[PDB]
Write a protein that binds this ligand. Sequence first.
Ligand SMILES: *C(=N)c1ncn(-c2ncnc3nc(SC)sc23)n1
Ligand SMILES: *C(=N)c1ncn(-c2ncnc3nc(SC)sc23)n1
Ligand code: NA
Lengths: 304, 306
Amino acid sequence: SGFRKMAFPSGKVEGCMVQVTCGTTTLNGLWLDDVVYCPRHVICTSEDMLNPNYEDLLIRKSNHNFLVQAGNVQLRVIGHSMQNCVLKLKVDTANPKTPKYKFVRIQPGQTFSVLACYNGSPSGVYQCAMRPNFTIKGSFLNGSCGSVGFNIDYDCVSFCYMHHMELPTGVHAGTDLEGNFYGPFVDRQTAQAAGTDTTITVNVLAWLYAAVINGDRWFLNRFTTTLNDFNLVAMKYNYEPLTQDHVDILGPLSAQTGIAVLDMCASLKELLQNGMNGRTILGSALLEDEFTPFDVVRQCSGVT
Amino acid sequence: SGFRKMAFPSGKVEGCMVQVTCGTTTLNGLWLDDVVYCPRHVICTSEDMLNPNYEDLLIRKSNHNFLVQAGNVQLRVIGHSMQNCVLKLKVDTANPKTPKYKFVRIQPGQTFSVLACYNGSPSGVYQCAMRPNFTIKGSFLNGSCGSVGFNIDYDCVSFCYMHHMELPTGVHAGTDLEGNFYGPFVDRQTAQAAGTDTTITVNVLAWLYAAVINGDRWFLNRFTTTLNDFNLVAMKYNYEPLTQDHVDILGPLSAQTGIAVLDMCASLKELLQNGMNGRTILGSALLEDEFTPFDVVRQCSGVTFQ
Ligand SMILES: *C(=N)c1ncn(-c2ncnc3nc(SC)sc23)n1
Ligand SMILES: *C(=N)c1ncn(-c2ncnc3nc(SC)sc23)n1
Ligand code: NA
């Protein structure tokens, strides 16, 4: 029993984290085979960052300007290039600890594990979701840039996030490993903000199913609803629309508990309209939307 | 900025997890140098569990009755002994991935990382606290016994918890790595139940300090309190007493934020009296008691967002 926000075991990723220094900036890089990936903003000073011409800044640097440290050992950079907003530093040594991996771009609503690192050294691991507004609610201090997010899908690590910056509201923005930002953000000092966010409906439903599986049932009721009427309510409470795809994706959880999706939707309607009346669900007083259906299934089955 | 329940990186522990089988029972073990530690109940049948005589069950086993699998490789058991409620299986091979480590027995209120494992293979990692009633609020299915809890301060792993069982309320009980149970629990199917739990006051305070460090002051007030009046009130909400040790331990968080401990105590009093009135603190609508002072200092900036 029990239900906890749970990260993937981080060991396969820990063996890929390195320190990258350029001038007076130190941040983290990801060392896979003979390439180290890191945010291209590592080459910028404060002044550069106001209006950077990355092409022009990079051509002025030599290989030997990039100091890359894997634990105690220096790696030698033998090439550098840019792909979108990430820098690729070719090094002389292949990482002997490179796991089987892929670069994937995730969708809003999907969760992943973050390995927070400072000076190329892993510090902590937690679970995040890509918010509808394409930010993440992370925990990152200065020096954390280049930390990555990942899922593990067999023995294969799927890297999906590299950290680039913090927005004024204290939430976080970054790229996929091909260097494309999640969201309408840029790696320069200009005014940028998180857009208004919404709640990830399908995930709240998943969590309601988790709660039932774990014996927390007080919010169930005799009523059912339709997709259209439910989505009228969702819109009103700043919830993402529920689609037929979401209903399909919730099928396994529905079958296991005997609660049809639209039956659970009637519970959620009531919670949104009436609140919780001083009660909690899985120890929370708010509705939790950072567990996916697959997250719930994985934790309430035991896959390893 | 931000604030999250954050576990230690699990890789140093992942390289120590193995599968142990005895008869039809499979669970997890912890492979350090040439010893595999696991719960002694691996030798029991379900019938045995009502009144097991572990000494008598164990004397009937040979080395070769214990099957230990490290990933793909079988290890050879060459010795066994029981210490308290753990079995130590001596094996032929030293773990080449053994980290620097020690065993520590923790106190109620201390937090640690759990690596939940099934069939000797890691499944996930999360943060837990030793509750005042000596249970943990974990996430564990059948097959999870032998999963361990740890901290990693510097490069040294401190093992503090091995999982043994689930209590009827759905909370979890286990031992230190010397095989002593936390709490009055036994590895026996009896009527045993977790005592009524309380909130870990010092940790709630720590978290209030975290919220200040991160730029939130709405819950502060102009009042102060004596330690004794605070404790008189707190006990009426099922909060653990705050001791002078706890006040000492909160000193650095007090210095960084400019808010005296007993002034933060007054804020908590008011929060308990009033609740939150639709507001959140660090994204929670409840008061959070699973972050220690040390946890807050580790995660938060040393510069308060004033
Ligand atoms: C990542 N290691 C990092 N530390 C500090 N910063 C940072 N500080 C100030 N401005 C700023 N702008 C960025 S992109 C628009 S990243 C950054 N990053
Ligand atoms: C740990 N690997 C595990 N799986 C299943 N059980 C278990 N099941 C039923 N009863 C029971 N009692 C125990 S100690 C009193 S452990 C256990 N454990
Ligand atoms: Na219903």
